[PDB]
């Protein structure tokens, strides 16, 4: 019983990809917001130990100079998709003199989102949020281990993403601005979290057209923490 990779449910699909989407929820949360001024993003680090060095844990990584990332779940598998995705974009620049568009990056990862094979290995359990600025301006993306990718206006993941997405739908509209989405985003963060909101808990990822570089805020992050 517990029909894995080669048996559908009698109604729907895999009891194992259902276990992977199930296995997303144990991870910490992250909220990216596509502002037309530039996609911002944040994540809960959930630091345990005092010895636990804060910059040792990464959630936002820089695929391309205007492309950050955000993970949810299985760490080194996600980082494998990071390094390989950076290779694929480097192939697109290598053969096209130009950046791979972020949606086509997500389709490139989303090809082997479901290409798990133990014959002819295991499926993955990590959900992904992608921040970029392509030729169509800012882009905010969300895929899943099941490969069903969708562009999202502002997406919350991980733990407590129900109330995070709900309150996000309360605070969100089309003409949101950058620092508005930043301070509102960390409002939702210190709502959904359990720890005291300090510099250690979170980190930012800010891509803009004029600020394609530097999907980050460095210790003025602390200043925006004391701005609320």
């Amino acid at each position: 019983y517990d029909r894995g990779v080669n048996t559908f449910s009698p109604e729907g699909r895999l009891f194992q990809v259902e276990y992977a989407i199930e296995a997303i929820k144990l991870g910490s949360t992250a909220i990216g917001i596509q502002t037309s001024e530039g996609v911002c993003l944040a994540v809960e680090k959930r630091i345990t130990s005092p010895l636990m060095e804060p910059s040792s844990i990464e959630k936002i990584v820089e695929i391309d100079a205007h492309i950050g990332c955000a993970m949810s779940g299985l760490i080194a598998d996600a980082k494998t998709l990071i390094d390989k995705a950076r290779v694929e974009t480097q192939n697109h620049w290598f053969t096209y003199n130009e950046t791979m568009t972020v949606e086509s990056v997500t389709q490139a990862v989303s090809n082997l989102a479901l290409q798990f094979g133990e014959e002819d290995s295991r499926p993955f359990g990590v959900a992904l949020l992608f921040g970029g600025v392509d030729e169509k301006g800012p882009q905010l993306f969300h895929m899943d281990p099941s490969g069903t990718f969708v562009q999202c206006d502002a997406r919350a993941i991980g733990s407590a993403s129900e109330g995070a997405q709900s309150s996000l739908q309360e605070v969100y509209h089309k003409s949101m601005t950058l620092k508005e989405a930043i301070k509102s985003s960390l409002i939702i963060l210190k709502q959904v979290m359990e720890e005291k909101l300090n510099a250690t808990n979170i980190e930012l990822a800010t891509v803009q057209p004029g600020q394609n570089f530097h999907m980050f805020t460095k210790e003025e992050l602390e200043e925006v923490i004391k701005d609320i």
């Binding site: 991870g27 809960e44 680090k45 407590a160 109330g163």
Partner: protein
């Protein structure tokens, strides 16, 4: 040794010369008038004969007899299967009495009214209204059902999360019952012998039919039976026959009458469609989690019976308890009260509510299974 042995010898010497120092008409004549009364051995009737009594009767064990009534009877109501009074010598019948009910199944009538109020099951008001409509409205006010020519439902199914109020609704009706409420555990049909639970269902509905307009509650119906499993081993059999006997003696071939059954389970999936079909149970009134300020209503229920700080809120902890059950809610409210009992105080504080939220949800909803690994964050 000298203190205890000497004091014990002193107490023993005290008890020794103490042991040596040691050396109605309430009804009595009426009982003496009851010595010319009669022993009145009750028996069991097989059948009568035509135009004459000529009654044929076993006692219970001895033998079977053609006998006659005494002439102090109502000579009509000496019918078949009727436990009646019979003389030791003359074998003459005196008075029919109601027969053997059961040894231990009389002991599941509730015979009381618990004080669970409809106001205390706040947060499920549609379930309250539909349960009010099925149970309370026909049994006390048949003012619209009969006066248009429609029927009330006879069966209502209940499930939900554990800690939602199946107990609250089942004991909530019993406050305002206006009916003989009857408790049924689904494991009550766990007997040893073959078809004994069928006899249990027999005397269950015989208790249901004598009294009119009454209540029977089914609780944990999973032990009563899941499905119609078939194998070459002979497994779930007495449960199966008792289950089908509960269907047939439930309803069909002259239905139950003016009795209502509420069923309840936690696994509504693994049930049989002979139970799941309507006619048996019409409104499948399910239960859900408190997802809104119904949580704060339950906080008002679990906070009104205690002195608290007047400057507290409940929506904050309600947002802190999204997926919580009301039993967990009462553990938070009464446990914060236990922090106030650890204090010398008399009114609890919102900080004590933070002690109970931050104590129960973190030390007894995350430490149950211990995580000793990060691997995720």
């Amino acid at each position: 040794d000298d203190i205890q042995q000497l004091l014990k010898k002193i107490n023993e010497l005290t008890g020794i010369k103490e042991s040596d120092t040691g050396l109605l008409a309430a009804d009595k004549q009426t009982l003496q008038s009851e010595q010319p009364l009669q022993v009145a051995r009750c028996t069991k009737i097989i059948n009568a004969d035509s135009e004459d009594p000529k009654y044929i009767i076993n006692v219970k064990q001895f033998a079977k007899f053609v006998v006659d009534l005494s002439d102090q009877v109502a000579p009509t109501d000496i019918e078949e299967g009727m436990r009646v009074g019979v003389d030791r010598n003359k074998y003459q019948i005196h008075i029919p009495l109601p027969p053997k009910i059961d040894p231990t199944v009389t002991m599941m009538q509730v015979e009381e009214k618990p004080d669970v109020t409809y106001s205390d099951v706040g947060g499920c008001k549609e379930q309250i209204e539909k349960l009010r409509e099925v149970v309370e409205t026909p049994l006390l006010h048949p003012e619209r059902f009969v006066n248009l020519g429609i029927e009330p439902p006879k069966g209502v199914l209940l499930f939900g999360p554990p800690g939602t109020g199946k107990t609250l609704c089942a004991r909530a009706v019993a406050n305002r019952t206006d009916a003989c409420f009857i408790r049924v555990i689904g494991s009550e049909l766990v007997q040893k012998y073959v078809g004994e639970g069928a006899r249990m269902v027999r005397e269950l509905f015989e208790m249901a039919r004598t009294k009119k307009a009454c209540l029977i509650f089914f609780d944990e119906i999973d032990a009563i039976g899941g499905a119609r499993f078939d194998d070459g081993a002979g497994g779930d059999n007495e449960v199966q026959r008792t289950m089908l006997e509960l269907i047939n003696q439930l309803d069909g071939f002259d239905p139950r009458g003016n009795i209502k059954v509420l069923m309840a389970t936690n696994r509504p999936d693994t049930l049989d469609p002979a139970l799941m079909r309507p006619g048996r149970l019409d409104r499948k009134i399910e239960f859900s989690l408190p997802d809104l300020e119904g949580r704060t209503h339950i906080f008002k229920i679990h906070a009104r019976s205690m002195s608290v700080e007047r400057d507290i809120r409940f929506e904050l902890l309600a947002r802190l308890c999204p997926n919580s059950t009301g039993a967990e809610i009462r553990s938070v409210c009464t446990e914060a009260g236990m922090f106030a009992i650890r204090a010398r105080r008399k009114i609890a504080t919102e900080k004590d509510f933070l002690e109970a939220v931050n104590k129960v949800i973190k030390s007894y909803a995350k430490f149950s299974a211990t995580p000793r690994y990060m691997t995720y964050n």
